[PDB]
Design a protein around this nucleic acid. Structure first.
Lengths: 380, 62, 132
RNA sequence: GGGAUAACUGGCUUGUGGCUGCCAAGCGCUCCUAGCGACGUAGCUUUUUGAUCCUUCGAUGUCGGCUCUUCCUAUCAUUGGGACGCAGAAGUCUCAAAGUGUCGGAUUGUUCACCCGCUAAUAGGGAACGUGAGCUGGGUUUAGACCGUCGUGAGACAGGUUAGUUUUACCCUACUGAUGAAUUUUAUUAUAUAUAUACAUAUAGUAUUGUGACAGUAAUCCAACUUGGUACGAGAGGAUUAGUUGGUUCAGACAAUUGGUACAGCAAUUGGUUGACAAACCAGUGUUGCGAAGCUAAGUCUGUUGGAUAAUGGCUGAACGCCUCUUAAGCCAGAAACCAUGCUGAUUAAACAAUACUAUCUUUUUUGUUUGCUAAUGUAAAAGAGAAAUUAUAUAUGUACCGGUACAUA
RNA sequence: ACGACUUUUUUGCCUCAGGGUGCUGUAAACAUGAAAGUAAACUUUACGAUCUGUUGAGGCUUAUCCCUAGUGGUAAAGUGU
């Protein structure tokens, strides 16, 4: 007979099987669609998660109960060292999907890139890449011409510079970024012109932009069904434990139906977050990157005592509204929105009012060490 | 920019940090941190805890 | 007249007993259901400052007893996040009894009253001795 | 000893129950059918109860609750429609619909029931009457006991009431997660500068980037206000629709803030103990207060738009001079439905591409393949294995002028 | 869980230390200081919970906190192709 009362099932089916991700680095499943009229441009950008802070923002939004006042909001910080482009890829459409036609490389690639195509850089003789890199410019042009003639999508091979970060690893993160824009010729022109130079975030995004964020979730190992799926606990009296589901299916059909949740891996899952607004795009050179019109104090984004487990941001950075998947020290992939966004949110202009730089190790009392020293006075 | 000021501590409160307690009388108390909040709740007089700024002011130790 | 409350943390699940705090002659109010509460498998109905409850009077004048009666919550001690950036809590939980469209039964609300409730009920706001 | 034979499922049938029809005497102010519908009559269903006794008595663990999942539709709500005894509003009947949802309690062992309250609605069902190597054991169905009636008695009771052990997974499969080699009777969407070429290409080893078949799939409903005290209405009342601002329920994350958490750490202190001071220890964590970091919710963020349609409304239009949504041919707009898009997996494809670097290696000729080993053979297809226009089907194709025209051609 | 994965192997990394950041709440030590009083000298000497001064001190702070070309370190060389 039917169950006595009805509830939604615990947990979405839509992410099963809940196994570990293949790779630490994220992957774009799909890019924005290529609207012809727009100029050639990058669609994605690679970054590292540094931590969260809070921000204070004044709200325009009319007819809201909140309305005029400033509000306090959580926000994430993603350090973005400028990407270096190293290769050009041309794909062509077949009934059996996209197949790569050829790839053309730059005339140099740095050691941080090179390290990724090895496991054991110290032990190796470091003989990778050198002879292909040599081959003369006519050859490159011939392949480019072949790409130019037939290919339907062009993507650029970009990489992170992890030495411009405080992170432990020196094997760079390589990732492909699709180019959307004009004619194949223009697309090719833009990548060729870009090629061996370095690409900062300001070239890819704009203030007030809405962005999609792709990241691998925080790991927990194997976790119990209650934790992993949200199942309500059984009563105390229960003989063989309580923290476990009380049925795993009917007698017929005579197998465990998959839909019932069981114990297992939790976290280290791939996840695509949509529609997060960028509140500010920092500039490395500026001393006043975390300053505001309201504050007028000289200070950097890096909070007092440094970010927990990430320390000191030193390059350019994105201050992103709210939260985004995965841990401290994790790579984050930024992606452009699939369709240009037409919401009342997407038009809006965020004049942020204050950025906290107090501690996130214990409960911060000051915005800088200079403030702290001033507050106490002479000490031993 | 401006900062509120604490009641139990004399510390300055940057926005988005501490908590607010309204007493039955209608008196609002702003505490910078949880520790200050518990100390107040248990009804310690601030001028008797040596670390806290209030003692320093009282004991001519400024 | 508006009812766009804005999220304020759940507190006061059903069977809660709160102070009455007015000149009705009720001394306490026992909340038995909350208006507009969801349908859900095993979650207790529960309130917050902006919510309209249905309660009974255990202790108080006799004619206030036994009848189901509408009330509005005025004070709560479960902490909530006000969007300005700090956590509020009152010393003790309190509501006031009302006519079904929210008209206050007595004449004066003795405690202080959260502004979050005041904005949501003009006819109640008036008779509040202070708004916080 | 017995399934030769009851109490349990399943099976047949469906009297009984439930559900749907058909008729039209009437009811419905007048009016068969807006809504009904007797007298009658035909079915369906197996959620009821029977009838039955095929299966199990060298044991299918016998009610209910809890938890959990999936299926169904005979739709309760939500979406889209049509009809009305429909002015609006409220609503009734009805069609596509199973996407999404379907609650808090009081009382009872309860299925059932009855209230009370919320609600958007508190729909109906199935899965061995779903769910006892998941639990629970209140009920019924052991031994003790009580009271009544019944029995001369021992004792009986589809009467009540009370105390009454709930065993085993480490097997196989399944399922959830974790690894992981092997993969030539095998593959293949090209290669080469308007022309070539499968009778061909493909060593291998690491590694990176992807490809993405195929499989999975998720968001949901409400309030408030503006539209409007308008339309409509005799007044009373009183909208759809957009739009704006919020919230619910779920999902997916996350910890800046807040809260929770302590065998990081400091401090306090009771009893004992090292002669005291100091340092400490011990009381299975001595006991307290605060308590970073990390987890964590009751805290924070985030949750698309096309294609093709159903119901249905239409259009052109014969059959049938007229008419006709097509109950012909030809068409169109149109739903929480369907499929994409999107998102997750993809040793689910014993799948695959590009690229970097590398290990005597490549070609031709000759002879051979009649201590476990240290020369060495297999064919699902050789006997001329011959054949690149392309488009129709109640006409095609060239060529010439400018899909039309002309002329050839099968 | 183990595997696995993520890393690094001398412009690194581990290691301490210094600095940063917090967390705790003002150490021991000394005073011909204060202190309810008390007792005993021919005004000075005894005992004294506790308190004040030197003292926002002392202690702790990566083991899964931050910074430092600051200190000292950095072996085995196996095995498969």
């Amino acid at each position: 007979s039917h169950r006595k009362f009805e509830r939604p099932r615990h947990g979405s089916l839509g992410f099963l099987p809940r196994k570990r991700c293949k790779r630490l680095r994220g992957k774009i499943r799909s890019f924005p669609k290529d609207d012809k009229e727009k100029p050639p441009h990058f669609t994605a950008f690679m970054g590292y998660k540094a931590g969260m802070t809070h921000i204070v923002r004044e709200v325009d939004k009319p007819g809201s109960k909140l309305h005029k006042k400033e509000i306090v909001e959580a926000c994430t910080i993603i350090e973005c060292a400028p990407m270096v482009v190293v290769g050009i890829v041309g794909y062509r459409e077949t009934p059996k999907g996209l197949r790569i036609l050829s790839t053309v490389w730059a005339n140099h690639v740095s050691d941080e890139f090179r390290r990724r195509y090895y496991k054991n850089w110290y032990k190796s003789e470091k003989k990778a890449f050198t002879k292909s890199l040599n081959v003369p410019e006519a050859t490159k042009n011939c392949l480019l011409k072949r790409i130019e003639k037939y290919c339907t999508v062009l993507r650029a091979i970009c990489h992170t510079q992890p030495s411009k970060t405080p992170l432990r690893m020196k094997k760079a993160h390589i990732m492909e970024v699709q180019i959307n824009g004009g004619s194949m010729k223009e697309k090719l022109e833009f990548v060729k012109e870009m090629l061996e130079k370095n690409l900062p975030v300001s070239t890819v995004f704009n203030p007030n932009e809405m962005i999609d964020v792709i990241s691998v979730t925080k790991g927990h190992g194997t976790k119990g069904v209650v934790s992993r799926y949200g199942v309500k606990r059984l009563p105390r009296k229960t003989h063989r434990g309580l923290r476990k589901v009380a049925c795993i299916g009917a007698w017929h059909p005579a197998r465990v139906q998959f839909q019932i949740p069981r114990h297992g891996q939790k976290g280290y899952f791939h996840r695509t977050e949509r529609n997060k607004k960028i509140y500010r795009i920092g500039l490395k050179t500026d001393k006043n990157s975390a300053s505001t019109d309201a504050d007028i104090t000289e200070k950097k984004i890096t909070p007092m005592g440094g970010f927990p487990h990430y320390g000191v941001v030193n390059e350019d950075f994105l201050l992103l509204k709210g939260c985004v998947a995965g841990t401290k020290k994790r790579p984050i992939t930024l992606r452009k929105n699939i369709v240009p966004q037409v919401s009342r949110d997407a038009l809006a202009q965020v004049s942020l009012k204050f950025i906290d730089t107090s501690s996130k190790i214990g409960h911060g009392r000051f915005q800088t060490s200079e403030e702290k020293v001033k507050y106490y006075g002479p000490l031993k | 920019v401006k900062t509120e000021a604490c009641s139990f501590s004399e510390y300055r409160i940057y926005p988005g940090r501490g908590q607010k307690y309204i007493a039955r009388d209608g008196k609002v108390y702003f505490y910078l941190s949880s520790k200050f909040a518990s100390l107040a709740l248990q009804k310690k007089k601030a001028a008797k805890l040596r670390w806290t700024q209030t003692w320093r002011r009282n004991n001519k130790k400024t | 007249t508006l009812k766009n409350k804005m999220r304020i943390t759940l507190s006061l699940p059903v069977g809660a007993l709160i102070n009455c705090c007015d000149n009705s002659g009720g001394k306490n109010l026992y909340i038995i259901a909350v208006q507009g509460f969801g349908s859900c498998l095993n979650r207790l109905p529960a309130a917050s400052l902006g919510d309209m409850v249905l309660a009974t009077v255990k202790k108080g004048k006799p004619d206030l007893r036994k009848k189901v009666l509408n009330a509005i919550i005025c004070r709560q001690s479960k902490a909530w996040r006000r969007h300005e950036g700090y956590y509020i809590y009152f010393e003790d939980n309190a509501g006031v009894i009302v006519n079904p469209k929210g008209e206050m039964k007595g004449s004066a609300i003795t405690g202080p009253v959260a502004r979050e409730c005041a904005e949501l009920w003009p006819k109640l706001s008036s008779a509040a001795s202070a708004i916080v």
